[PDB]
Structure formats: structure tokens, C-alpha cells
Amino acid sequence: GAMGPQGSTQNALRRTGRVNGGHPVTTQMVETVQNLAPNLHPEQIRYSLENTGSVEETVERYLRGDEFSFPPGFE
Structure with missing residues (x-):
């Protein structure tokens, strides 16, 4: 037979x-941090979210006033 x-x-x-x-990361992550961090640029958020991997971490580093750079192609 077959095998x-x-x-x-x-x-x-x-x-x-x-x-x-x-x-x-997704759009929902960007808007979440943005809503909770209105002082930040929406584009820098995407980059920070990709580096950190979470909104929460991005919000935690934001509230401590850490460094937020821009994504590739912005500069």
C-alpha cells in the first residue's frame, strides 16, 4: 500500500x-502611548515601541523622561 x-x-x-x-508593532500601540504621552511625537513612538517591544515600557520610559529618537527615514 502507500506510505x-x-x-x-x-x-x-x-x-x-x-x-x-x-x-x-501596530497602530494601536502608537495611539495608546500617544494618548498617554501627548507631549511626544507620534512617529518617535513607533520607533520606541519597536525597540522596547511594548506600549507599557514606552509609557514607563516616557514618564521617566528617557530618550526618544525618530524612526529610520525621518532624519
């Missing part, structure tokens, strides 16, 4: 240390 055990070695790339260097 087909369909099972490959699911051993992906060796366990990394820290997956960082930009995170996927």
Missing part, C-alpha cells in the same frame, strides 16, 4: 540568548 511518515528533524536554529533588535 508517508511525514516527520522531519524539527531542530530549528540553536536557542538564541535574547531575541531583540526590533519588534513588530
Whole structure:
């Protein structure tokens, strides 16, 4: 009869240390920080959200007055 055990070695790339260097963000994240941080530019928020990976972290660093740079192509 037919056959087909369909099972490959699911051993992906060796366990990394820290997956960082930009995170996927959405419009909802930008507006959230913006609403909670009206003193900030809406474009800088997107960049900070991608670096930090969360709105909350962006809001926490905002309230402490940390550095907020602009996203690539703005400068």
C-alpha cells in the first residue's frame, strides 16, 4: 500500500540568548502611548515601541523622561 511518515528533524536554529533588535508593532500601540504621552511625537513612538517591544515600557520610559529618537527615514 502507500506510505508517508511525514516527520522531519524539527531542530530549528540553536536557542538564541535574547531575541531583540526590533519588534513588530501596530497602530494601536502608537495611539495608546500617544494618548498617554501627548507631549511626544507620534512617529518617535513607533520607533520606541519597536525597540522596547511594548506600549507599557514606552509609557514607563516616557514618564521617566528617557530618550526618544525618530524612526529610520525621518532624519
